[PDB]
Write a protein that binds this ligand. Structure first.
Ligand code: MG
Ligand code: MG
Ligand code: MG
Ligand code: MG
Ligand code: MG
Ligand code: MG
Ligand code: MG
Ligand code: MG
Ligand code: MG
Ligand code: MG
Ligand code: MG
Ligand code: MG
Ligand code: MG
Ligand code: MG
Lengths: 261, 133, 206
RNA sequence: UACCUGGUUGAUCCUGCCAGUAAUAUAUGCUUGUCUCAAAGAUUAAGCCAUGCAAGUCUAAGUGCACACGAGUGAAACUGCGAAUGGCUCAUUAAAUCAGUUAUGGUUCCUUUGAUCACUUGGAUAACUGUGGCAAUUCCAGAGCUAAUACAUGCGCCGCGUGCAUUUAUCAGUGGUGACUCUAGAUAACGCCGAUCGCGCGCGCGGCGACGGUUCAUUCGAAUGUCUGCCCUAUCAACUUUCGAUGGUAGGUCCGUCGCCUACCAUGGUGACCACGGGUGACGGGGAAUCAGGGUUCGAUUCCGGAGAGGGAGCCUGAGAAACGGCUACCACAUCCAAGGAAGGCAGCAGGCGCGCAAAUUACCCAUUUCCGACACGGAGAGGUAGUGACGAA
RNA sequence: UUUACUUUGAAAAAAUUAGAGUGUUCAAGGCAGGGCCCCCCAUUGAAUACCCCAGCUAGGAAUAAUGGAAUAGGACCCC
RNA sequence: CCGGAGCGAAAGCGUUUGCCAAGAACGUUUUCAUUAAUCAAGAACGAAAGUCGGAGGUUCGAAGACGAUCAGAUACCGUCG
RNA sequence: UACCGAUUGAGCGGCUCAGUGAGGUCCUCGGAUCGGCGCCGAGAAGACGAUCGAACUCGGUCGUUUAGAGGAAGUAAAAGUCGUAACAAGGUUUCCGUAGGUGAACCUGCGGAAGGAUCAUUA
RNA sequence: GGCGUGUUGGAACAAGGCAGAGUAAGGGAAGUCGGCAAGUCAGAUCCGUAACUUCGGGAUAAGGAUUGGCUCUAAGGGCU
RNA sequence: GCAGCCAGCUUAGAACUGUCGCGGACCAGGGGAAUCCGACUGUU
């Protein structure tokens, strides 16, 4: 309590990692970076558990110490990088281009090569701060700072920026009808279409998202991550966008596929 | 009167006049626009932000300067007996001099402000006269 | 040491609360300003976060402004005359915020004559002896004399304000916090705020 | 499984408790062939501790003449950063901690990410060589050299210009907010602009990296507030302020709000809906045991949060500590002295004494788990493994 | 006129518990694997419930309070 | 007379007459119009004995004396008070 | 086994009145000294004052733990002595409140109650 | 207003007296039948005051703090 | 509704100040816990 904490217990880790409780006591505390600790995935896990290309914690160090991984094209050396949402993880040595995207549930999936789409990403703007002499600023999703914004962009829209130039190419306005991937718990990964936006003066605003099969629900305004203009997304989605097969529905698919294999 | 010179920091005095800001559907009435008082803790004249919460209560005592005691009642549910118990928490709120007819039994709607005293963290924003004369 | 915490006070009900923990550093306190009047003595204080704070112990000059007009000239602070907090901040000559002082009027008149070209703080009967003051009453060009005419029509300051120009001591007020900012900035009283403190000075000096 | 049975009588039906019954958790008794898991000095003594260890750290990249080995890894050495985490214990603490809730428009930050941003002049100094003091310590003194990424150097006003950080006063209305005394603009004024390093070409050059500053970010997080919720006690009924108790004004103070403090004023605030006071074998919670339902009891205990490091108090440094495996005192306790002085905090890991009804090995190693630094290399009693183990479970 | 009450969703740490999924030889548990010579639980998993109270979010208007006009400063339209 | 009859919140209350201000029940197309019920804290009243201060002390009669009975009566019984 | 108890109690422990007050911070000063070179600079020891405040010497108060000559009860023993209070009309019906008295249970007065041995006693 | 110090002067300043309730280091009742003696305390203001009690008291209980000088501020009136 | 004028004597607060000294002389209760006796004041 005298300052910053530098350890993370395994049982205290976010559930989205699925760690073995009988191997160690501590979890890999993701190094400080652009994303929240609760909404990220340590680079060691994605290379040791998800991809299984590393067997221990010292072998994943040999991945970054040989300059093969590169988040957003920039090779990193910290094996505990946040690697949050929409973070393109390209591997030019192995030709693989991963994007850490959520499943129908809240987990980090192995979304493979998206070369023609991996060259950019999507970023949610937070605030519009005015600099000196009237120069506005925009804070993007993964702490990337973009200046000189268009006067039509607001504090809720999304933008696409190339990994090299880092300039705003296109933007998607926020209104009723835009494709979205809800984030913030109990809907993490549910992809749908925005339908309504309730206004609450002095507190959070409520928005309603309708999935593909009509699974309409409600969530806060701070939970919207617009991914497509209307109903068409920009980047490749994993197996099942927002269908969210129920326990009974998932049960039907598992028995019908194992009997054939 | 007082010992210092009562004045608003933002505006400039007469040379060779009131500032109000509440928002949130509790804008300044006609009594607090022109006004005859000056105080730094008034919801209109002073600098106070309605940012935290919105509550309600009934004023009980008016024996203080620019402050009154409200009574916020509620019922606490005891799970064992499946019943409730009558509880109440008194709060000291800052009363602006513009509000009148707040003697007793009046319903007071308050808003969470920055700490203005050791116990005062809410300011009156609405006065509703009871059924009387 | 000094602390501004709350767990050492009594509760709103009046009951004494026991301290949950010992004194912490993030709630420390430091001695009062007590900024006297003296030449250029300021100490630097390292504060929360590795920053710097300027402790003004004694200051003689003040960057005051004029209320009615638009004039901000640094002037020498002479003495304090009254303080609404307590008469102890004027018996010990401590420069704090919102205390009325008697500051010099030489920078104010130097700019008033160069802008309005009208004698204000001159003695009734005496004339301008030095040659440097006659240049403010000369004949100028056509483009120069035209602007001084529209400025002379609006120059009648209040009679309660022109009196202090005769003695060279203007009733100013320190509008900044010296102990924290390290600068005794402020402004000059005018209008109703000038009459209020003059009545308190008259009662205190009567 | 939503369960009862013995005992008042000569006998009977009742009230009613005792006893019987079954889990649970501590101890203990006797007994104990195998395997997989697993609690384990919390209870009385947050009692006291012999020895050892637990934070240091070097890359191709701030500074590199130990010749020990021979340009180059180099040991020492100066600079940078960590040591504020973890661990341990539950003493303190009863709207306090804590839990949900959430405010900072009432606050700041190391690392990380993304921004952005006067031809190198100056003199010492460590290691070391050399001369010494003290019985003694992680004590150092004197002199002589030798390094710095340590330290220091397109307009307003009226002839003719051209970066700024902050502090007050005044005027006007780019992007915002539910609401700014917001972010911007303008007026009068008032310690940030790179004297740094590596593997490496052509012929006055460029294309690859690090480190570091300035205000805005982000993030790991902190800190202080709103709403709601604590066991027992009235043989505690009124309580709080001739030292702030409640509120008002101004100011001081702090990162910031505030009786946080000072000064002038008001006589307030809380209270039978239990304040205040006292007690707790009280750290709070997530939870545990037992339960038809309703409940009862427990939660020192591996997670989270808080608290503390013999008792307090006061500080240094740092972005972050009122730090104690850092200091300065006093108190308690205690060690070595040559009697001049010096040096102490196992409620860290093992172990000892004491206390008890009550609780393990001075064991092996950084491989997993990860954490810290100049980092692929080095460090971790945090942790992992084994021994002891009839807590307990399969 | 606004509350109490009920329902829905986000929130209401993880572990634990309840509990879907998996033959750790079984079980306590674990979150991991049966089979075809680099594919195959359709780029092998994967869920959920509960989380009291309070606050927050979207309905209903039964019950029980409260309340709009009696010296009408009455509700509406005027002008 | 005086009763398993009345009244009062109870304790309690019965000779005549007079004075004084209450109370239930009933009567009612009166009146008021939910102004309630039960009630920690608080209070009135509360047989008798006892206590303090006066009057009066017939009878009775704590205490006490004495007479009887008994193994023993410091009692029942008796006189007296 | 607890209570009462002189002792003008007490080993034992918490917040505090009033004193005294180490230490640090801060402030007002001080200027040993070495870098310039006879003036601007850095600058230790040390000191006034303020502030935080351990701790100590005396008190107040609260909580808590204990010694005590002696005194007076309760319970458990054996039920030993005395008498018979109660349980049948318990041989004086019992019992309540109250008061007095008496070795002892008890007696008596006054007012009660039936839990009485009367649910009843005649115009 | 009264007076010459109370029925005399001068000079010395030994012992021992009487008085000044003189002072006294360190100790502080060890003195003595006995704190005899005089020592402490003392006025006023602001605080704080127990056991016990006939509720009146005990009580100035006990125990504390303050007190000068100077320069100001504030409040407490009358009259036309 | 006050302006003018007049009149004292106390009380509170603050600064400054001297050697921390200040009811500076004078005036002016030591206190506490108990026992015995007499109630007290008064009297001898
Ligand atoms: Mg003579
Ligand atoms: Mg004579
Ligand atoms: Mg003599
Ligand atoms: Mg003598
Ligand atoms: Mg004497
Ligand atoms: Mg003596
Ligand atoms: Mg003697
Ligand atoms: Mg003797
Ligand atoms: Mg004497
Ligand atoms: Mg006495
Ligand atoms: Mg006696
Ligand atoms: Mg006598
Ligand atoms: Mg007597
Ligand atoms: Mg007498």
């Amino acid at each position: 309590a005298r300052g910053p904490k530098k350890h993370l217990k395994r049982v205290a880790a976010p559930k989205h990692w699925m760690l073995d409780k009988l191997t160690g006591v501590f979890a890999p505390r993701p190094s400080t970076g652009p994303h929240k600790l609760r909404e990220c995935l340590p680079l060691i896990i994605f290379l040791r558990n998800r991809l299984k290309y590393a067997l221990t914690g010292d072998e994943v160090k040999k991945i970054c110490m040989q300059r093969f991984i590169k988040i957003d094209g920039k090779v990193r050396t910290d094996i505990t990088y946040p690697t949050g949402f929409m973070d393109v993880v390209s591997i030019e040595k192995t030709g693989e281009n991963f994007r850490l995207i959520y499943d129908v549930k809240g987990r980090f999936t192995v979304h493979r090569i998206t070369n023609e789409e991996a060259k950019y990403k999507l970023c949610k703007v937070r605030k519009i701060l005015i600099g000196t002499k009237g120069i506005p600023h925009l804070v993007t999703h993964d702490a990337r700072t973009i200046r000189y914004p268009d006067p039509l962009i607001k504090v809720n829209d999304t933008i696409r920026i190339d990994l090299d130039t880092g300039k705003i190419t296109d933007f998607i306005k926020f209104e009723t009808g835009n494709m979205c991937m809800v984030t913030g718990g109990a809907n993490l990964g549910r992809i749908g279409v925005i339908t309504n936006r309730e206004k609450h003066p002095g507190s959070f605003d409520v928005v309603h998202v309708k999935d593909s099969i009509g699974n309409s629900f409600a969530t806060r305004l701070s939970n919207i991550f617009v991914i497509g203009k209307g109903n068409k997304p920009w980047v490749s989605l994993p197996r099942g966008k927002g269908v969210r097969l129920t326990i009974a529905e998932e049960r039907d698919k598992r028995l019908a596929a194992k009997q054939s294999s | 009167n007082e010992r210092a010179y009562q004045k608003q920091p933002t505006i400039f005095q007469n040379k060779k006049r009131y500032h109000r800001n509440v928002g949130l559907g509790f804008k300044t009435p006609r009594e607090a626009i022109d006004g005859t008082y000056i105080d730094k803790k008034c919801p209109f004249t002073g600098n106070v932000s309605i940012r935290g919460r919105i509550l309600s209560g009934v004023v009980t005592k008016m024996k203080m300067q620019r402050t009154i005691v409200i009574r916020r009642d509620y019922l606490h549910y005891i799970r064992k007996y499946n019943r409730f118990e009558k509880r109440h928490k008194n709060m000291s709120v800052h009363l602006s001099p513009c509000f009148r007819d707040v003697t007793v039994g009046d319903i007071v709607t308050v808003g969470e402000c920055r700490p203005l005293s050791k116990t005062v963290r809410f300011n009156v924003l609405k006065v509703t006269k009871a059924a009387g004369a | 040491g000094i602390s501004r915490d709350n767990w050492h006070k009594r509760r709103r009900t009046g009951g004494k609360r026991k301290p949950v923990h010992k004194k912490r550093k993030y709630e420390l306190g430091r001695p009062a300003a007590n900024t006297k009047i003296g030449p250029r003595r300021i100490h630097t204080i390292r504060v929360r976060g590795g920053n710097k704070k300027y402790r003004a112990l004694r200051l003689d000059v003040g960057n005051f402004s004029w209320g009615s007009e638009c004039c901000t000239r640094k002037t020498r602070i002479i003495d304090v005359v009254y303080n609404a907090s307590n008469n102890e901040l004027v018996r010990t000559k401590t420069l704090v915020k919102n205390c009325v002082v008697l500051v010099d009027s030489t920078p104010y008149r130097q700019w008033y004559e160069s802008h309005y070209a009208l004698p204000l703080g001159r003695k009734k009967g005496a004339k301008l002896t030095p040659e440097e003051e006659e240049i403010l009453n000369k004949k100028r060009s056509k483009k120069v004399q035209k602007k001084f005419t529209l400025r002379r029509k609006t120059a009648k300051i209040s009679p309660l304000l022109e009196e202090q120009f005769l003695q060279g001591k203007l009733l100013a007020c320190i509008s900044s916090r010296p102990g924290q900012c390290g600068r005794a900035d402020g402004y000059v009283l005018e209008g109703k705020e000038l009459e209020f403190y003059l009545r308190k000075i008259k009662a205190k000096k009567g």
